[PDB]
């Protein structure tokens, strides 16, 4: 079923900050903001961790869109091939989630990669989830009405405990 990262890195503070740093031409900025919140809350409702949004500076989880090389060691590669990537909890690059601007992204009303699904998968990595062997899992390794699977819930609660 689920996996974590080696040595089970996790956020150990009660509050973790996040920032939407850069946007996509494909959607209104407000829509990206609302879908990012919804994705974080899918995972957050299950566990004792709280997320605080910031609008400037460095936050724990930096989220954004980029083309090509963008300051980490893993440049994007134009249309196709890698779509997005995210880093396990930790200082610096840890927690950050990046999306390739050279794809097409949608809120569900157009052609594109469904941004809510993709953000829920990437932010699973930002919280410490690896990939699952269960085809039903959001954390399965390969890509409109979804929720987290039982396997996704079991793994995140294994890592953080359950929310009371």
């Amino acid at each position: 079923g689920y996996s974590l990262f080696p040595n089970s890195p996790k956020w150990t503070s009660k509050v973790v900050t996040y920032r939407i740093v850069s946007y996509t031409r494909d959607l209104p900025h407000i829509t990206v903001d609302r879908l990012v919140s919804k994705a974080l809350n899918m995972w957050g409702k299950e566990i004792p961790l709280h997320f605080r949004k910031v609008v400037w500076g460095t936050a724990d989880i930096m989220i954004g869109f980029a083309r090509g090389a963008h300051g980490d060691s893993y440049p994007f590669d134009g249309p196709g091939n890698t779509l997005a990537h995210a880093f396990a909890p930790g200082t610096g690059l840890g927690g950050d989630a990046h999306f390739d601007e050279d794809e097409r992204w949608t809120d569900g009303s157009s052609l594109g990669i469904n941004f809510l699904y993709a953000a829920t998968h990437q932010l699973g990595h930002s919280l410490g989830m690896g990939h699952s062997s269960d085809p039903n899992a959001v954390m399965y390794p390969t890509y409109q009405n979804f929720k987290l699977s039982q396997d996704d819930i079991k793994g995140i609660q294994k890592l953080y405990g359950k929310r009371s």
């Binding site: 990262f5 080696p6 060691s73 893993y74 890698t82 779509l83 997005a84 990537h85 995210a86 880093f87 396990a88 930790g90 690059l93 990595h125 989830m129 690896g130 990939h131």
Partner: peptide, 5 residues
């Protein structure tokens, strides 16, 4: 893609 660092 999940990356380590």
């Amino acid at each position: 893609x999940g990356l380590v660092x």
